[PDB]
């Protein structure tokens with residue numbers, strides 16, 4: 001009765017994929033991470049009375065040159081695509097990634113969401129909320145902004161992709 005879910009987190013370097021993940025899992029904000037080594041975490045959470053057993057695959061740095069596989073894996077139940085609101089490059093990259101991801105998964109019913117991280121750095125924002133939102137809307141995907149410094153926003157992200165997967 002405990003549900004199991006594998007979630008992959010994708011995106012450009014230094015957008016905070018690791019920090020968001022560690023914050024969701026361990027409740028702390030970390031200022032450094034091995035950016036080219038893929039990490040997988042496990043995490044239990046109860047959502048609306050249901051117990052979930054999470055595996056979170058925190059992917060290594062990706063950019064527009066990264067090889068995406070041509071076939072999807074049955075055991076991955078959702079994809080979180082992260083860019084940083086402080087980096088134009090990361091926003092452009094996440095669009096290239098979504099494109100390659102779609103080529104990989106085709107029409108399979110595996111949810112994809114879009115996250116603009118680092119909303120706490122408001123003096124360095126270069127991506128508007130509307131841009132992320134409308135990009136997500138054009139993908140028919142969920143959209144959130146987040147800050148890895150703010151536990152609740154990290155929780156909201158992962159909770160959303162779980163809710164989407166069951167939709």
Ligand SMILES: Nc1nc2c(ncn2[C@@H]2O[C@H](COP(=O)(O)OP(=O)(O)O)[C@@H](O)[C@H]2O)c(=O)[nH]1
Nearest residue numbers: 013014015016017018019030031033118147148
């Ligand atoms: N202020 C702020 N800094 C962040 C946030 N997320 C990540 N960082 C910092 O950005 C740097 C890269 O983050 P990291 O998670 O390692 O990026 P990754 O390559 O996508 O895994 C680290 O120094 C983090 O401490 C955030 O939401 N707010």
Ligand SMILES: [Mg+2]
Nearest residue numbers: 017018058059
């Ligand atoms: Mg990472």
